[PDB]
Amino acid sequence: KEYLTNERIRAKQVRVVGPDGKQLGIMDTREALRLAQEMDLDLVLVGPNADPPVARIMDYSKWRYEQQMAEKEARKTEVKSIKFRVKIDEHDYQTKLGHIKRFLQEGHKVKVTIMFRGREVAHPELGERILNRVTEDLKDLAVVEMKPEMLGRDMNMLLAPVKV
Amino acid sequence: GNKIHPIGFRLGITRDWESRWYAGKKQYRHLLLEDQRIRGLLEKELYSAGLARVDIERAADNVAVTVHVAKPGVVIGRGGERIRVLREELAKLTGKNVALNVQEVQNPNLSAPLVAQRVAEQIERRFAVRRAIKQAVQRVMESGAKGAKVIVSGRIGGAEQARTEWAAQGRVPLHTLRANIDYGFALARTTYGVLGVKAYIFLGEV
Amino acid sequence: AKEKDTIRTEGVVTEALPNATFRVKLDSGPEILAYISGKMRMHYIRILPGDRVVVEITPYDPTRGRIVYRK
RNA sequence: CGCGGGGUGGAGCAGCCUGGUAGCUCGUCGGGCUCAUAACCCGAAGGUCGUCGGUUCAAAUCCGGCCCCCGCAACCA
RNA sequence: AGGCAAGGAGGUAAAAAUGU
RNA sequence: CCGGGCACUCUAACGGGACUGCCCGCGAAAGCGGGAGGAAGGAGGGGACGACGUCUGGUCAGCAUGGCCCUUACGGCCUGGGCGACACACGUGCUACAAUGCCCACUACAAAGCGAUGCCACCCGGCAACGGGGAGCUAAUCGCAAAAAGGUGGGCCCAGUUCGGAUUGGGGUCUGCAACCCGACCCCAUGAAGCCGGAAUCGCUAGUAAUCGCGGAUCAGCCAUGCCGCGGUGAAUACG
RNA sequence: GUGGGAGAGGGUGGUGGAAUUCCCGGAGUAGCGGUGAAAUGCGCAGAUACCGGGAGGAACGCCGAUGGCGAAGGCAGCCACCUGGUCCACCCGUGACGCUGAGGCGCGAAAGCGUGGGGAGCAAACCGGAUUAGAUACCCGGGUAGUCCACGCCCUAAACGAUGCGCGCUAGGUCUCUGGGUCUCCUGGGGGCCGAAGCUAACGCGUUAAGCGCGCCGCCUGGGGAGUACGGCCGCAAGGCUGAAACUCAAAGGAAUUGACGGGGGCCCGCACAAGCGGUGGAGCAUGUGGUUUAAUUCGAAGCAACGCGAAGAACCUUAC
Ligand SMILES: [Mg+2]
Ligand SMILES: [Mg+2]
Ligand SMILES: [Mg+2]
Ligand SMILES: [Mg+2]
Ligand SMILES: [Mg+2]
Ligand SMILES: [Mg+2]
Ligand SMILES: [Mg+2]
Ligand SMILES: [Mg+2]
Ligand SMILES: [Mg+2]
Ligand SMILES: [Mg+2]
Ligand SMILES: [Mg+2]
Ligand SMILES: [Mg+2]
Ligand SMILES: [Mg+2]
Ligand SMILES: [Mg+2]
Ligand SMILES: [Mg+2]
Ligand SMILES: [Mg+2]
Ligand SMILES: [Mg+2]
Ligand SMILES: [Mg+2]
Ligand SMILES: [Mg+2]
């Protein structure tokens, strides 16, 4: 994802855009560089595809750093995927339910996802049967986000906390 | 598995061909075919005689069919007439002037194919296969051949399992060319399935 | 006597059960406890729930069958 | 009716607020990796940001209305 | 100064489920 | 070209040559470091060759063979079709995405192999594939055949283009009884995607990779860019 | 008995520093800590790191051992007290007073529980963060009981030398610690190691025997069921002792041996990775395959070692559909 700086800029007449919400026109590469120098914020080819390449006057590195930080923040609060079957047992089901409950308590969203084989005929019903029941059980902690929808080789149900 | 045919290995060196004669591209295949046919027919006939090398030459439509044999009188007849009949048959098979040489082998236990054939015969009337092999080996040793390995495989004793029966004696440097190893092959044609009679004999250096 | 009053009826495998025994849902009624035939075991032919298999059923007790056919 | 907050690749959510420059997780499909399955990794596929507008050289972003979704009150009568 | 070795340091040896 | 020569290459039979043999140094030895002479040095390079066994690997579809099963058909013959079908996926290759290139024109060096209804010199017809005529060989003695990249000169000028060549239309050439399914080839038109490729990954230690052509076998013809083979240019880097 | 000796033996009372934390004081500022990486965590009210003192509580560095002590559990700063065991030397006193021990009584780590205290660190549970498909876990940040003491109770353990105690005999050597000697060597008592004979299933044991005996006690008669039920006793509880059967399986096992295997070790190797050049995957096409479709798409090959493979020549042929 290269928004390109200073003399990473090959294009002749770049659309020299300012830092904020201003422009300087469609000016040369050298001109753009000079402008960047003036602001001390780098010249950055943020839209190369655009009607002459969009060349923002921004400090590139700092911006990138900020973006990275934001990304990191986004990493976390999160979603737990509880994977059911068609051939899954009653004790197993209970275990899964318990896990889901724990997750809810913690403050995590819940993708209860069923993983299917062949017999996508007597798969969907069983997926519903398990998942619906589970949802009914955890109603006290959980507002269902996504209902039991069959999606080709899988089935999803999702639960969100009522409150945390 | 592995192991290339031991004569095939030699051939260029101390060993010489099962037949030698020139033929160019136009007529080479025909002659070869004829030779093959001859070999087949002789095998069908002289299985009694015990044969190793069926050496052929073409000194210009003078086909040569030297039989290297164990039982020389079996070839000739009782005077000199089964030699004659066979010759006639051979002539009939190939439309050219032809002869029949017999160069019987001093010590048949020295010739490996003969040994193999013997072993096969023994197997066919059902002997203790391993025992037979051992006996053969002993015979070979007595005959002086400094090495003998006799692999017989497949369903030994009519047993319902893919078995390899081994047993060997002496130096068998199946690898050095300077070995003059006589290889012998025979096919034990027995009722329950075929037993492969592979035989080797190491009999002289340089 | 060697008795062939045996029923050779189709059945979609319902239940995965232990020891290569599988309750298979027959089209001769219900799902009986049907076990693998030795040939299948030998050839390592895997049965999962959902296979329309021929199941060998003796009249003496139809409770137990045999997965005769490889799916 | 009164007020606040949000509507975004299929779902959850970042970014809006500070005009230009849309990300991650789950899901879809394909591959890889593995002896093989999950797991894994990768991609590829896939959003104009509810919508109609205007602003401005240029809107997810500034602004209005409608459409929704959440909640709080709705009093004297 | 090198020669070997004893001991003390500290750095390294990540993680990776299963069964025809 | 010829006489003429066996000198040189060569061709292909025989034989020498290298053995850690010589020297130094280390080492008990084996051997190791370096040198010398020597075309070659420590197995000179490369083959050919694959131990007991293993995976009940693979092949009853090359052949052989036990058993079972079929015998007016699970046998036989032909004609036509099918093996080439195509929403997809993978493997293996080629050709690319250019200017260390592309095109055109001249010019120069190979080896190894083949060739008899086979290769086809040369001559003309044709833009050409080829066609016709026709010498020559029975192959070191002629032919395939031009090797190509390369070298000189010209053009092209950074573009999806003189890059790239797929597809699609049209005319033909050849083989064969017959190329519609489903041949190759020529010529003209068409000129798509692709601007060096994600995770992953594979080859390669020297005349090696990389790239460049030629020969072949099967074969009427060829879907051969495959395989097998031969030479031309000719690298990198290995601390570990 | 007398003369000695060694020692973390036990209890009672004290003290001695390092260290930790916590408090005050000072100087000082932008992070500390933490990790395979990180994040939670603390820090501007100023942490951390550094010095000064003080407050505690706990443990005892070096010596320190392959060592010493006890009957075992166990036990280490040091000192004092009370106090066990033991070893030698003299062979002086007694004259078989001994050995063993069902029961019984006593001790009995650690955890646990009761009553009261104390509480620095560590730290189950627990609350966080990461790690992860999941994380009740390994890893980090706290954190309660508990660890510590008194008194009481609990009584189990790989309570191990997996070796009951007692004595007698049956090669040595070698190192050790501790006593006496006529002291470069003898002779006792302990602790180890190697090995004669012998034993053992082998490993190993081998004067500290698992050797040869004798003495007595404890227990064993296939594994699982199960140290469970059932009773009984003990206990404030947790549980402990005491201890089956029904059934079930043709095994549960030990010791070694050959291999294989190990995210076991050492030594090696190979284009195996690195170092390098060129690709593959992205494009089209050439092909072979899987899948799919077909009237049939003949059949096989399957990770390396199936996938320009059989096929080194599918228009008909070939050809098997
Ligand atoms: Mg039956
Ligand atoms: Mg005393
Ligand atoms: Mg302070
Ligand atoms: Mg006395
Ligand atoms: Mg007296
Ligand atoms: Mg703590
Ligand atoms: Mg966590
Ligand atoms: Mg936790
Ligand atoms: Mg902790
Ligand atoms: Mg307490
Ligand atoms: Mg015990
Ligand atoms: Mg006792
Ligand atoms: Mg002691
Ligand atoms: Mg002693
Ligand atoms: Mg002994
Ligand atoms: Mg010992
Ligand atoms: Mg014993
Ligand atoms: Mg217990
Ligand atoms: Mg009780």
State the nucleotide closest to B176 in CA–C1' terms: F49
A119 chain-C contacts, CB cut-off 8 A: 49-50
* CA separation for the pair B187, B121 (Å, rounded): 9
Give the start-end residues of each E strand in A18-127.
23-27, 43-47, 54-57, 79-84, 109-115
Is the CB of residue C5 less than 8 Å from the CB of residue C59?
yes
CB of C60 within 7 Å of some strand E atom: no
Q: How far is the CA of A95 from the C1' of G144 (A)?
A: 29
Instruction: Give domain A75-161's CATH number out of 2.60.40.10, 3.20.20.70, 3.40.50.170, 3.30.110.10.
Output: 3.30.110.10
C70, with CB counted inside 10 A (0-12, 13-18, 19+), is: middle
Instruction: Tell me which residue has tokens 């001859």.
Output: B38
CA of C51 to nearest chain A CA: how many angstroms apart? 9
Collapsed DSSP state (helix, strand, coil) of residue A8: coil
The architecture of the domain spanning A4-73 is: Roll (3.10)
B8, with CB counted inside 10 A (0-12, 13-18, 19+), is: exposed
Q: How far is the CA of B28 from the C1' of F173 (A)?
A: 37
| Residues in Cβ contact with B57 at an 8 Å cutoff, skipping those fewer than 6 apart | B19, B20, B21, B63, B64
Single out the residue of B125, B200, B128 nearest to residue B170, CA to CA.
B200
| Residues in Cβ contact with A96 at an 8 Å cutoff, skipping those fewer than 6 apart | A82, A84, A88, A112, A134
* CA separation for the pair B134, C18 (Å, rounded): 53
Longest dimension (CA), chain C: 35
CB of A79 within 7 Å of some strand G atom: no
Q: Say whether A118 and C16 touch across the interface (CB within 8 A).
A: no
* CA separation for the pair B47, B43 (Å, rounded): 6
Instruction: Kindly report each contact of residues B125-129 with a partner whose C-beta sits within 8 Å and lies 24 or more positions away, as own/partner.
Output: B126/B157, B126/B158, B126/B190, B128/B157, B129/B156, B129/B157, B129/B165, B129/B195
* CA separation for the pair A90, B9 (Å, rounded): 70
Query: CATH for B107-206?
Result: 3.30.1140.32
Q: How far is the CA of B147 from the C1' of G59 (A)?
A: 83
* CA separation for the pair C71, B62 (Å, rounded): 68
Q: Which helix (H) or strand (E) holds A17?
A: strand A14-17
Query: Which residues of chain B form CATH 3.30.300.20?
Result: 16-106
B197: left (phi over 0), alpha (psi -120 to 50) or beta: beta
DSSP code per residue over B19-46: EE----TTTHHHHHHHHHHHHHHHHHHT
Is the CB of residue A14 less than 8 Å from the CB of residue A22?
no
Is the CB of residue B201 less than 8 Å from the CB of residue B159?
no
Q: Which helix (H) or strand (E) holds B139?
A: helix B129-142
Residue B95: HSE in the Cβ half-sphere, 13 Å Cα cutoff = 1
Whether A75-161 and A4-73 are alike in CATH topology: the answer is no
Q: Show the CA angle centred on residue B172, arms to residues B167 and B178, nearest 5°.
A: 165
Query: CATH for B16-106?
Result: 3.30.300.20
Resolution to one decimal, Å: 4.2
DSSP single-letter state for residue A99 = H
β-pair type (A14-17, A23-27):
antiparallel
Q: For chains C and A, tell me whether 3 or more CB atom pairs sit within 8 A of each other.
A: yes
Q: Say whether C50 and A122 touch across the interface (CB within 8 A).
A: yes
How was this structure determined? It was done by cryo-EM
State whether CATH 2.40.40.20 applies to domain C1-71. Answer: no
Q: Which helix (H) or strand (E) holds C41?
A: helix C38-43
Residue C36 CA: distances (Å) to CA of A60, B51, B170, C13: 68, 56, 54, 11
